[PDB]
Structure formats: C-alpha cells, structure tokens
Amino acid sequence: SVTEFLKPRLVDIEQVSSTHAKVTLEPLERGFGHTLGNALRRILLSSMPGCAVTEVEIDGVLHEYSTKEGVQEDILEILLNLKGLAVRVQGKDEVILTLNKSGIGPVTAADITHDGDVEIVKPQHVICHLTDENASISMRIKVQRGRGYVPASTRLLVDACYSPVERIAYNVEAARVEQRTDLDKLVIEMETNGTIDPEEAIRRAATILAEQLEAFVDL
Template sequence: MIQKNWQELIKPNKIEFSSKKKTLTTLVAEPLERGFGLTLGNALRRVLLSSLRGAAVTAVQIDGVLHEFSSIAGVREDVTDIVLNIKEIAIRMEGDGPKRMVVRKQGPGAVLAGDIQTVGDVEILNPDHVICTLDEGAEIRMEFTVDTGKGYVPADRNRAEDAPIGLIPVDSLYS
C-alpha cells in the first residue's frame, strides 16, 4: 500500500535555480502535488537558515561612547539606533576568525556601509545601507568586529569577559 502511494505522487521533473542578487536565490521545482510546495519550501528555508554559515558584525566600538544608551553630539541617531542599523549590514567573509573593520567620516551627510574600510577577504553586500547621519561639523569613528557563524547569536553571548569599556556587543544573524 505504501509503495502504491509513493508511485502515484506527482514528482518534480524540472528543478531550476536562479540568482538575481548576491543575497537571494530562487529555487523552482515543478510540478508538485497540491500543498507540497509550501511544505517543502518551509522545510528547506528552516534547514538553510539554521545550517548555513555566514558573517556578521559581533561588536562595535564608537569613539567617545561608553554604552549603547548614549548619544553622540552632531549625530541624528542615538547609539541604540546606530546598533540596530549595524545589525542590518550584509557581509561576505572568506576565512575564519574575527576581523576588524573601521569607518571614519565627517559631516554633513550619511555614513553608509560602503564607507567602511574592509580588509581583503571581507565584502559589504549592501553598501548603500545607512548606518547614521552626521550634521555639519560632526565626526564619527567606529571599529567593528566581524566573525563567521551559524544561525542567530544574541548580543550577550558576543560579549567577552575581558572586553574593554565601550565595546558594544551586537546580535548576530549569520544566515
């Protein structure tokens, strides 16, 4: 009986992958039984999000800032908003181990992810992403720690016991 059930299922005969962006791939498998597409898609998404390795910012140190509830003169966003914007930076990194990146900018204008000075094997995938906005005469310097991992790691697990004062841990979404 089980053998008969599997033989009567509609099995996909066409599977295509298409990449339109560096961070997005579409998989098309057809034809499928009614309702199987959603079931297979959710299972595949969950497995990929929990299993794929990626890179993310794990900590940031901003000159003149001691904690994430501070504000910076001449910067429109407070440090909490800046950290939220930093979490959205998409990064590709070859190799393992933590890497350091720095951004230094003077106002007026927006500080973009593309302004970050990266090391050789680190690439910013969304260079137009706004980190913060500077007013006339304002200046900011931030140093980021980037690492590789899987899944999601909350900020409290990114905090080293011997971390210097002013190092702000960041939630890391690696996938």
C-alpha cells in the first residue's frame, strides 16, 4: 500500500581490517541513501559517548612548546601521540593516569600505571622515544568521558577526540528492484580506533538516532 517502504536486504559488511568496515545496505527507496547515511554520519561524527585523553601535564614544560633533554620528539608531537591514544573507561569516569618512565627505547601505551577499568585498546601505541640515558619523562594525563570532538581552542590541553569513529563516509549508488529504475544503495564505510567495532559503531549510532524519535513513532 501507501505505507510500505522498502527495507534493505543487506548484501555486504566486509571488515577489511577489523577496525575498517564497509557496509552495503540495500535496496533503499529513492533518496533514502542520503537521509540515512547523512544522519548516521552526523551522529557518528559529533555525538558519540566515549573516553579520551583531554589534558596531559608534563613536569618539564609549562607551555605547549619547549625542549626536553632525553626525548627527540617535540612536545606538540607528544600531544599528538596522546591524541591517538584510545582509552576505554568502565563505569567510573574522569580518570587520570601517570606515565613516568625512563630508559633507552620507545614509550609504548603499556608503560602507564595500569589502573583498574581504564583499558588501553592498543598497548603497542607509541608515545615518545627517550635517548640513551636515565632520561626522565614523567607525565600526568587526564581523560574524561565526552560526546563529540571538542578542540582545545574551546577551553596543557588537548583536542579531545572523544568519539570512537575516526572516519565515516557513505555513498549512494543506483541499486534496482526488478523494474524500478532508481533506488538507493548505501555504502557506509567506517574506521574506528578500536574502542568499538565499526559494526557496533553503526549499531550504537542508529540506536541513538532511533531513541531520539520516541515521542513521534507510532506502532
């Protein structure tokens, strides 16, 4: 009748790397590719609960800029290497970690004071490299649980990439049922740091968007 919209008959979800999925929803009724994909990527990009490093106070720099004998990296590249640090907090919130260390090699993610619920998704992640010495590198990092991506300009702060999703990008291509000329074929294609799977990322985003419409749906 005049209320039977096409529901998709999924033809692909191909995890390319287990942090890079690509989902071929179809066949969506015409123009539904853009509504659906755009709503899901607006949500996945600017409203997604997650924890992430917010501000790290290093002992040896009062600025965002200095030299630090022992590390060859700059300090802004240490803020960089922290922005890529993907932490997952359990039921508690607003944890601080410490990463005091010294030696010869790199400084992975596992070299934190490993607290209870705070989980490093890739301990192999590289923060900074120290020289051949007893060179001191002691830092107190401070994470929180937030929603979108808040830069540090809105506030040693860090641009807080709270959301899991690193890159959403859909495409609408012309699918087809037996005679109908044009319909939709959403090709979502997602990446995440690992804190939540791409499949689960889309699932949670769509669940958010569907919860928002509770006052309006009818049976």
